[PDB]
Amino acid sequence: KNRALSPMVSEFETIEQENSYNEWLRAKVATSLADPRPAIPHDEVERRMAERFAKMRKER
Amino acid sequence: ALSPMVSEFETIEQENSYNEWLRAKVATSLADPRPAIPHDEVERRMAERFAKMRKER
Amino acid sequence: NRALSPMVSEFETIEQENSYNEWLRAKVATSLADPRPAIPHDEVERRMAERFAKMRKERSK
Amino acid sequence: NRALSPMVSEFETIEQENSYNEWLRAKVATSLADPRPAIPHDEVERRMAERFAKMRKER
Amino acid sequence: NRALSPMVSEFETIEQENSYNEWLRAKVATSLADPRPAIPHDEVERRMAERFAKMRKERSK
Amino acid sequence: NRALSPMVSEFETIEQENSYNEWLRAKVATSLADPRPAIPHDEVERRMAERFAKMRKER
Amino acid sequence: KNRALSPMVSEFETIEQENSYNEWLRAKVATSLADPRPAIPHDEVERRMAERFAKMRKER
Amino acid sequence: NRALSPMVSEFETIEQENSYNEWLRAKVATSLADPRPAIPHDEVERRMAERFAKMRK
Amino acid sequence: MLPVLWLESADTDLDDITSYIARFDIDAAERLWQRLRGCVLPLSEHPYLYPPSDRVPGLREIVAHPNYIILYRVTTSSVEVVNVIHARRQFPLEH
Amino acid sequence: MLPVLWLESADTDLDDITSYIARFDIDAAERLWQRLRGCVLPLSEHPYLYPPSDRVPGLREIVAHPNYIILYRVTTSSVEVVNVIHARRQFPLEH
Amino acid sequence: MLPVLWLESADTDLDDITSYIARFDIDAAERLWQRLRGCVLPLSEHPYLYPPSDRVPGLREIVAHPNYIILYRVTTSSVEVVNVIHARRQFPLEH
Amino acid sequence: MLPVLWLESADTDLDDITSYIARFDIDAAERLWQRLRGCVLPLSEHPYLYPPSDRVPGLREIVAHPNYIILYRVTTSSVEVVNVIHARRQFPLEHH
Amino acid sequence: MLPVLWLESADTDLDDITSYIARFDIDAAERLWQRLRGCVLPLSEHPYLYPPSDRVPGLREIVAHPNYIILYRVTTSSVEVVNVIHARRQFPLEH
Amino acid sequence: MLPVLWLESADTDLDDITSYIARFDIDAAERLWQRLRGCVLPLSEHPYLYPPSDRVPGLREIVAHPNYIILYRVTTSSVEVVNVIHARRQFPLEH
Amino acid sequence: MLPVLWLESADTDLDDITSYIARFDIDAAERLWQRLRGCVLPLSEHPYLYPPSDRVPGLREIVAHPNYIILYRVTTSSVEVVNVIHARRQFPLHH
Amino acid sequence: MLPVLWLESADTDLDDITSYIARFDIDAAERLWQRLRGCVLPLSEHPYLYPPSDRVPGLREIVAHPNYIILYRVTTSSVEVVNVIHARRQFPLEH
């Protein structure tokens, strides 16, 4: 039995929504932790973001 | 017109209405003459309110 | 009353724990209600240091 | 030995207290001898979280 | 006075550097003589916020 | 190009600013492309000390 | 009574001299902790030091 | 030459200081020219522990 | 270190929010109080941790929960919690 | 001090979120990245600021914005950002 | 910082505990006073260090020694030591 | 600040203590872990908050609970939790 | 942690600098304030980061921008921002 | 911490700058090196202290002096000083 | 992090030491102040670099120069420099 | 973290010094080794703590004891103790 949740007691609208989300989240994390690529320094994420925005703005 | 990926508000008129409510709520809150209470008095009240709730069941 | 494991509680039974916690709030409630003022930590240090001075001079006759 | 006052000691007698302390040093010696690397706090968090989950579930 | 390379000094002459430094010492001495207490950083932000807002209203009218 | 106030910018015109920044970007791009290894800071200190020592002895 | 000390073994020439120095130091510390004046921020010491050097150099 | 005050310098003359610093720069240059590998701090600890043990026999 | 203090409006916000949630789920109410309390007390050593508010100049906002925001200010002598509000609804309201 | 690193998955998340928001408002995208950036960099000096995750033991959750959560872990050698997710929907999705 | 103060009843506790102990082992009475003194002094700079009390809401408990607890509260202006009690016996009694 | 780490011995003690208390009262076990965890994490910003141990040189003692002590030490790079023990009894030591 | 305060003269400097810059480019004035603000708040946790000033003994200078310097000092109880000036010209003045 | 390294280009920059200044004033050149030196070494414990560069994405700029800027980057294993340039002129060059 | 403070006695120590040296060499005295200053400010982020003094219980000694020792202590709220002495002779004997 | 290594010359110095002292007072030899060891071990987390040497460029000096100096340097990959010398006498001397 699904239950509706008040928007002052949950960011989810039904317990099914919430349970589904937490299972998706746990799965998303498991996948990220299993990737074998090395982690990147914060400032390279900076570089990538800076250039992505630059790319996006070169359009209109 | 705001995508829920973009904003916790659905439009700019509903955002601005919330922000004006907030600003007025704060103004009111800051004007009150009553003294601030230390954090641990808040803890004491919170403990009392939960205790009262749990009893009444 | 039913015994508690000494890995579970610092009290031997539940009655003994409740007896303690009621005593404790009663002791606190008294302390907070006392009209006398609070004293700086330094005064407690002095009082204590003098209370030991007296003790050891006493144990010397 | 002879009994210590419960307001003076957490041990019932001196012999009991010295036994504990020798036991305690033995424990510390073993722990520092363990060749395994220390784990970050947040991995202890996750081991605890799972040990409570399995306990609770098996009930 | 003696002229200075734009890569030796941020000032053009030694005269202008000495004048600046005396000016700055004077400014600081005034600042620390002001009787009024210091204000929290977030009050400076509040004022900065409202001044920028003011400037933007005026600029749009 | 048009002049900017000395309070607003450390360049006198937009043209001068843009020039500088594309210069800087080029400079950095070659620096990073250099195949040689980075040197520890104390090696830089050693070289600076000697560079100054030379300058002084030449009065 | 006294012993001379090797310059490789001690920064003092004599154990009477080492002990004299250490009692002097304990005395010196004790009066410092007993002064009732407040401690001053590091930067104020820096101000005091700057003005003393500046005075010294002028006075020459 | 020049004598030096014991509160100005850990040396007594300006040559003794110059002599020491030349000797030091020499000692270092030799040290850096030795072609042997550095040893980890732990090996120095074990060596020292053994040297003291021998000395107490 | 700055001491942490709540304005009284902020405590009735807390009273209103947990009262309301508790009509549906007391544990959820008590879990939220535990979150809010744990967000606020480290402000005594990191008062500038959270960004200035865009909407209320001079205040700072904590997003404590996807549904709740704490507004606080850093004064000369203390950290004051000013209000606790739902992040997307105008709640709790004005009694 | 622990250095701050991002897992490649977390940066993909970043790329997915900002590109979608930019379909509507590039400015808002930049603002959110500016917020996310500001939540994680003080972890370098205060790794245990944000609370342990209830849903993913071993990680900690930053509620950076009422719609976005950062998941991170404190390792022996670094703070790693593991994922950036929408707080209410399952987004960014799989790839 | 907050100044540390003792309620008069705390100093009576501390008096009653030290005199009882010292009619056995006076150096033990002094060692304990040194423990309690050292537990309390850092409260001026870290008043929220010790956990909230579960049995007396609004106070905090220091477990200074396996047999002794310090109860204190942090105030608008001060840290106040409220009582010093045995942790398992009801001692000291009032008088 | 220093990062906080547990030696595997300390994690084992923590396992032994909570599982044993959990034979009787699993909430009491969970409350104790919450106390121990909250005693340790402040050490990251104030490693020297507790005085060196008289009986175990090199270590520092936290009395987290009238029945439980945390032993820890400060190193060049970290705060390390070394053991978690009963304050009064020789507990825990598994018999392997 | 030392809290960050501004002397009123430093806030006047700030008012005059941002005003003058905004007569030409208001977005540059806002960008400069954001740089100044970001130079100053890490002083709360690292007050001795910047070099002691050689022209004004007892203060320290941040070169926040090729044209602007922040002069500040570390007191018993706080970091105080004392003045914000142009690096090359005798500006802001008079008042 | 992260150890501090210079790219060979930065040391050349540094040689070009000090040698040029030393044509006019060798003390000024030595003071400037002492300033640069003291800006760079604290990056080993606070690498994220200075703002991202808006001109060279992925680096950060120290305004060490109203005329000189240090560009550095924070890698996985080290802080790298990348270049030292004049803040307003295209100086020095690169060979 | 703790603030660095000097007891008035230690600044008198500094005054006399540098005065005496300056009779012979002002530059030597100025270089010694620069050394002493550089030994003391890193105490702010690492108050406990130096081990407890064994001849002055409560204090820690820095050997700042083969002829000068700094005695300091760590309090609940600050690093305090207590005295600056000559390492070998009983020197120095209001500000 | 950078590993702490000794050059063979440094260990020879340490052999030469402790053996000399041990002919008079072996406990003093041990105390000195304990002191040098203590100065050097934090170098793996604070390699730049001690100041650049004036007389040997590229190295740094620890005044470990009024009579003894440690010379060390920070390489790409490590901290290397280079020599241990008497602060005042040319000792130990060559082989």
Side-chain angles (χ1 to χ4, degrees), chain L residues 19-37:
Chain L
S19 84
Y20 184 87
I21 292 171
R23 317 195 174 168
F24 302 79
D25 186 346
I26 181 160
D27 295 338
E30 203 177 4
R31 293 193 316 260
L32 177 70
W33 160 237
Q34 302 180 336
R35 176 74 72 75
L36 297 174
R37 157 184 73 176

PDB file of all heavy atoms in Angstrom, chain L residues 19-37:
ATOM      1  N   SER L  19      27.621  -5.546  19.360  1.00  0.00           N
ATOM      2  CA  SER L  19      26.895  -6.792  19.177  1.00  0.00           C
ATOM      3  C   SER L  19      26.568  -7.434  20.517  1.00  0.00           C
ATOM      4  O   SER L  19      25.515  -8.053  20.672  1.00  0.00           O
ATOM      5  CB  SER L  19      27.696  -7.745  18.305  1.00  0.00           C
ATOM      6  OG  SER L  19      28.618  -8.435  19.111  1.00  0.00           O
ATOM      7  N   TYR L  20      27.438  -7.282  21.507  1.00  0.00           N
ATOM      8  CA  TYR L  20      27.139  -7.840  22.815  1.00  0.00           C
ATOM      9  C   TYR L  20      26.003  -7.084  23.490  1.00  0.00           C
ATOM     10  O   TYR L  20      25.086  -7.685  24.048  1.00  0.00           O
ATOM     11  CB  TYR L  20      28.381  -7.827  23.700  1.00  0.00           C
ATOM     12  CG  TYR L  20      28.109  -8.489  25.021  1.00  0.00           C
ATOM     13  CD1 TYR L  20      28.264  -9.856  25.181  1.00  0.00           C
ATOM     14  CD2 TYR L  20      27.654  -7.758  26.098  1.00  0.00           C
ATOM     15  CE1 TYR L  20      28.000 -10.462  26.383  1.00  0.00           C
ATOM     16  CE2 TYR L  20      27.366  -8.361  27.279  1.00  0.00           C
ATOM     17  CZ  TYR L  20      27.555  -9.700  27.437  1.00  0.00           C
ATOM     18  OH  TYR L  20      27.263 -10.265  28.656  1.00  0.00           O
ATOM     19  N   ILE L  21      26.063  -5.757  23.491  1.00  0.00           N
ATOM     20  CA  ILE L  21      24.973  -4.988  24.077  1.00  0.00           C
ATOM     21  C   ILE L  21      23.687  -5.285  23.331  1.00  0.00           C
ATOM     22  O   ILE L  21      22.606  -5.393  23.923  1.00  0.00           O
ATOM     23  CB  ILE L  21      25.315  -3.490  24.065  1.00  0.00           C
ATOM     24  CG1 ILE L  21      26.462  -3.211  25.026  1.00  0.00           C
ATOM     25  CG2 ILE L  21      24.110  -2.647  24.438  1.00  0.00           C
ATOM     26  CD1 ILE L  21      26.971  -1.786  24.893  1.00  0.00           C
ATOM     27  N   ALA L  22      23.795  -5.486  22.026  1.00  0.00           N
ATOM     28  CA  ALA L  22      22.623  -5.775  21.223  1.00  0.00           C
ATOM     29  C   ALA L  22      21.977  -7.115  21.565  1.00  0.00           C
ATOM     30  O   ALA L  22      20.816  -7.321  21.227  1.00  0.00           O
ATOM     31  CB  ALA L  22      23.006  -5.712  19.759  1.00  0.00           C
ATOM     32  N   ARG L  23      22.676  -8.037  22.225  1.00  0.00           N
ATOM     33  CA  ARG L  23      21.977  -9.221  22.707  1.00  0.00           C
ATOM     34  C   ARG L  23      20.843  -8.842  23.638  1.00  0.00           C
ATOM     35  O   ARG L  23      19.857  -9.567  23.737  1.00  0.00           O
ATOM     36  CB  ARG L  23      22.915 -10.159  23.458  1.00  0.00           C
ATOM     37  CG  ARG L  23      24.255 -10.374  22.839  1.00  0.00           C
ATOM     38  CD  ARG L  23      24.980 -11.550  23.403  1.00  0.00           C
ATOM     39  NE  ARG L  23      26.215 -11.774  22.637  1.00  0.00           N
ATOM     40  CZ  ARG L  23      27.222 -12.581  22.986  1.00  0.00           C
ATOM     41  NH1 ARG L  23      27.172 -13.307  24.112  1.00  0.00           N
ATOM     42  NH2 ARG L  23      28.280 -12.672  22.183  1.00  0.00           N
ATOM     43  N   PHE L  24      20.969  -7.719  24.338  1.00  0.00           N
ATOM     44  CA  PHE L  24      20.019  -7.319  25.360  1.00  0.00           C
ATOM     45  C   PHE L  24      19.111  -6.190  24.941  1.00  0.00           C
ATOM     46  O   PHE L  24      17.979  -6.138  25.405  1.00  0.00           O
ATOM     47  CB  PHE L  24      20.745  -6.868  26.623  1.00  0.00           C
ATOM     48  CG  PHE L  24      21.641  -7.894  27.204  1.00  0.00           C
ATOM     49  CD1 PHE L  24      22.886  -8.132  26.663  1.00  0.00           C
ATOM     50  CD2 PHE L  24      21.254  -8.610  28.312  1.00  0.00           C
ATOM     51  CE1 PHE L  24      23.713  -9.074  27.199  1.00  0.00           C
ATOM     52  CE2 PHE L  24      22.087  -9.562  28.848  1.00  0.00           C
ATOM     53  CZ  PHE L  24      23.311  -9.787  28.289  1.00  0.00           C
ATOM     54  N   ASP L  25      19.589  -5.276  24.096  1.00  0.00           N
ATOM     55  CA  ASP L  25      18.927  -4.000  23.850  1.00  0.00           C
ATOM     56  C   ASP L  25      19.595  -3.316  22.670  1.00  0.00           C
ATOM     57  O   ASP L  25      20.608  -2.636  22.836  1.00  0.00           O
ATOM     58  CB  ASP L  25      19.009  -3.135  25.102  1.00  0.00           C
ATOM     59  CG  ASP L  25      18.228  -1.856  24.991  1.00  0.00           C
ATOM     60  OD1 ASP L  25      17.824  -1.476  23.866  1.00  0.00           O
ATOM     61  OD2 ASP L  25      18.029  -1.223  26.056  1.00  0.00           O
ATOM     62  N   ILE L  26      19.050  -3.490  21.471  1.00  0.00           N
ATOM     63  CA  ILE L  26      19.776  -3.036  20.295  1.00  0.00           C
ATOM     64  C   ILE L  26      19.777  -1.506  20.197  1.00  0.00           C
ATOM     65  O   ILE L  26      20.694  -0.915  19.616  1.00  0.00           O
ATOM     66  CB  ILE L  26      19.191  -3.726  19.057  1.00  0.00           C
ATOM     67  CG1 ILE L  26      19.929  -3.321  17.804  1.00  0.00           C
ATOM     68  CG2 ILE L  26      17.748  -3.407  18.907  1.00  0.00           C
ATOM     69  CD1 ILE L  26      19.718  -4.291  16.698  1.00  0.00           C
ATOM     70  N   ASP L  27      18.785  -0.838  20.787  1.00  0.00           N
ATOM     71  CA  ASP L  27      18.800   0.619  20.824  1.00  0.00           C
ATOM     72  C   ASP L  27      19.910   1.127  21.727  1.00  0.00           C
ATOM     73  O   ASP L  27      20.595   2.100  21.393  1.00  0.00           O
ATOM     74  CB  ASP L  27      17.456   1.162  21.308  1.00  0.00           C
ATOM     75  CG  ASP L  27      16.328   0.852  20.370  1.00  0.00           C
ATOM     76  OD1 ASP L  27      16.588   0.609  19.179  1.00  0.00           O
ATOM     77  OD2 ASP L  27      15.168   0.872  20.822  1.00  0.00           O
ATOM     78  N   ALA L  28      20.081   0.505  22.893  1.00  0.00           N
ATOM     79  CA  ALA L  28      21.188   0.890  23.758  1.00  0.00           C
ATOM     80  C   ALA L  28      22.513   0.736  23.032  1.00  0.00           C
ATOM     81  O   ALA L  28      23.396   1.581  23.161  1.00  0.00           O
ATOM     82  CB  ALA L  28      21.178   0.062  25.037  1.00  0.00           C
ATOM     83  N   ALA L  29      22.666  -0.329  22.253  1.00  0.00           N
ATOM     84  CA  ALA L  29      23.862  -0.468  21.435  1.00  0.00           C
ATOM     85  C   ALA L  29      23.979   0.684  20.450  1.00  0.00           C
ATOM     86  O   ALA L  29      25.045   1.285  20.307  1.00  0.00           O
ATOM     87  CB  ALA L  29      23.850  -1.807  20.699  1.00  0.00           C
ATOM     88  N   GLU L  30      22.887   1.013  19.763  1.00  0.00           N
ATOM     89  CA  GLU L  30      22.966   2.088  18.786  1.00  0.00           C
ATOM     90  C   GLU L  30      23.204   3.441  19.456  1.00  0.00           C
ATOM     91  O   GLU L  30      23.962   4.263  18.938  1.00  0.00           O
ATOM     92  CB  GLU L  30      21.714   2.122  17.926  1.00  0.00           C
ATOM     93  CG  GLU L  30      21.949   2.786  16.604  1.00  0.00           C
ATOM     94  CD  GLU L  30      20.737   2.751  15.727  1.00  0.00           C
ATOM     95  OE1 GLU L  30      19.690   2.260  16.207  1.00  0.00           O
ATOM     96  OE2 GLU L  30      20.835   3.219  14.566  1.00  0.00           O
ATOM     97  N   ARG L  31      22.609   3.686  20.623  1.00  0.00           N
ATOM     98  CA  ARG L  31      22.896   4.944  21.308  1.00  0.00           C
ATOM     99  C   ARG L  31      24.352   5.039  21.724  1.00  0.00           C
ATOM    100  O   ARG L  31      24.926   6.125  21.727  1.00  0.00           O
ATOM    101  CB  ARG L  31      21.982   5.148  22.515  1.00  0.00           C
ATOM    102  CG  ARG L  31      20.538   5.359  22.105  1.00  0.00           C
ATOM    103  CD  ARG L  31      19.666   5.865  23.211  1.00  0.00           C
ATOM    104  NE  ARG L  31      19.949   5.128  24.423  1.00  0.00           N
ATOM    105  CZ  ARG L  31      19.216   4.122  24.881  1.00  0.00           C
ATOM    106  NH1 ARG L  31      18.131   3.745  24.207  1.00  0.00           N
ATOM    107  NH2 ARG L  31      19.591   3.504  26.007  1.00  0.00           N
ATOM    108  N   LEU L  32      24.974   3.922  22.069  1.00  0.00           N
ATOM    109  CA  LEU L  32      26.353   4.011  22.521  1.00  0.00           C
ATOM    110  C   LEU L  32      27.279   4.347  21.365  1.00  0.00           C
ATOM    111  O   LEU L  32      28.157   5.210  21.504  1.00  0.00           O
ATOM    112  CB  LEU L  32      26.758   2.724  23.226  1.00  0.00           C
ATOM    113  CG  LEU L  32      28.215   2.742  23.640  1.00  0.00           C
ATOM    114  CD1 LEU L  32      28.387   3.731  24.753  1.00  0.00           C
ATOM    115  CD2 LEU L  32      28.629   1.391  24.118  1.00  0.00           C
ATOM    116  N   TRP L  33      27.062   3.716  20.204  1.00  0.00           N
ATOM    117  CA  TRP L  33      27.835   4.059  19.015  1.00  0.00           C
ATOM    118  C   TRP L  33      27.703   5.539  18.678  1.00  0.00           C
ATOM    119  O   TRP L  33      28.688   6.198  18.306  1.00  0.00           O
ATOM    120  CB  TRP L  33      27.403   3.189  17.835  1.00  0.00           C
ATOM    121  CG  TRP L  33      27.757   3.722  16.473  1.00  0.00           C
ATOM    122  CD1 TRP L  33      26.897   3.970  15.450  1.00  0.00           C
ATOM    123  CD2 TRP L  33      29.058   4.100  15.997  1.00  0.00           C
ATOM    124  NE1 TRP L  33      27.573   4.479  14.372  1.00  0.00           N
ATOM    125  CE2 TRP L  33      28.899   4.570  14.684  1.00  0.00           C
ATOM    126  CE3 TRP L  33      30.337   4.082  16.553  1.00  0.00           C
ATOM    127  CZ2 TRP L  33      29.961   5.004  13.926  1.00  0.00           C
ATOM    128  CZ3 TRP L  33      31.385   4.532  15.801  1.00  0.00           C
ATOM    129  CH2 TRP L  33      31.194   4.984  14.505  1.00  0.00           C
ATOM    130  N   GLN L  34      26.503   6.094  18.837  1.00  0.00           N
ATOM    131  CA  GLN L  34      26.320   7.507  18.549  1.00  0.00           C
ATOM    132  C   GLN L  34      27.104   8.382  19.513  1.00  0.00           C
ATOM    133  O   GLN L  34      27.693   9.393  19.103  1.00  0.00           O
ATOM    134  CB  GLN L  34      24.840   7.846  18.545  1.00  0.00           C
ATOM    135  CG  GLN L  34      24.127   7.004  17.541  1.00  0.00           C
ATOM    136  CD  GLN L  34      22.652   7.250  17.447  1.00  0.00           C
ATOM    137  OE1 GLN L  34      22.009   7.736  18.389  1.00  0.00           O
ATOM    138  NE2 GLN L  34      22.084   6.851  16.315  1.00  0.00           N
ATOM    139  N   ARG L  35      27.157   7.989  20.781  1.00  0.00           N
ATOM    140  CA  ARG L  35      28.004   8.684  21.743  1.00  0.00           C
ATOM    141  C   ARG L  35      29.486   8.585  21.367  1.00  0.00           C
ATOM    142  O   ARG L  35      30.189   9.593  21.317  1.00  0.00           O
ATOM    143  CB  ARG L  35      27.753   8.105  23.124  1.00  0.00           C
ATOM    144  CG  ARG L  35      28.607   8.640  24.210  1.00  0.00           C
ATOM    145  CD  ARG L  35      28.214  10.027  24.614  1.00  0.00           C
ATOM    146  NE  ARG L  35      26.953   9.977  25.354  1.00  0.00           N
ATOM    147  CZ  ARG L  35      26.864   9.564  26.604  1.00  0.00           C
ATOM    148  NH1 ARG L  35      27.969   9.198  27.240  1.00  0.00           N
ATOM    149  NH2 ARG L  35      25.694   9.521  27.195  1.00  0.00           N
ATOM    150  N   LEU L  36      29.982   7.372  21.103  1.00  0.00           N
ATOM    151  CA  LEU L  36      31.398   7.174  20.783  1.00  0.00           C
ATOM    152  C   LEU L  36      31.799   7.936  19.531  1.00  0.00           C
ATOM    153  O   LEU L  36      32.858   8.570  19.477  1.00  0.00           O
ATOM    154  CB  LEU L  36      31.688   5.689  20.572  1.00  0.00           C
ATOM    155  CG  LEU L  36      31.513   4.706  21.707  1.00  0.00           C
ATOM    156  CD1 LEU L  36      31.725   3.307  21.161  1.00  0.00           C
ATOM    157  CD2 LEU L  36      32.482   5.036  22.816  1.00  0.00           C
ATOM    158  N   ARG L  37      30.985   7.838  18.492  1.00  0.00           N
ATOM    159  CA  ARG L  37      31.239   8.581  17.266  1.00  0.00           C
ATOM    160  C   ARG L  37      31.308  10.086  17.528  1.00  0.00           C
ATOM    161  O   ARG L  37      32.186  10.777  17.007  1.00  0.00           O
ATOM    162  CB  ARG L  37      30.153   8.215  16.252  1.00  0.00           C
ATOM    163  CG  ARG L  37      29.933   9.218  15.178  1.00  0.00           C
ATOM    164  CD  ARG L  37      28.792   8.823  14.306  1.00  0.00           C
ATOM    165  NE  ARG L  37      27.486   8.983  14.932  1.00  0.00           N
ATOM    166  CZ  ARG L  37      26.329   8.760  14.315  1.00  0.00           C
ATOM    167  NH1 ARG L  37      26.326   8.366  13.059  1.00  0.00           N
ATOM    168  NH2 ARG L  37      25.175   8.932  14.954  1.00  0.00           N
TER     169      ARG L  37
END
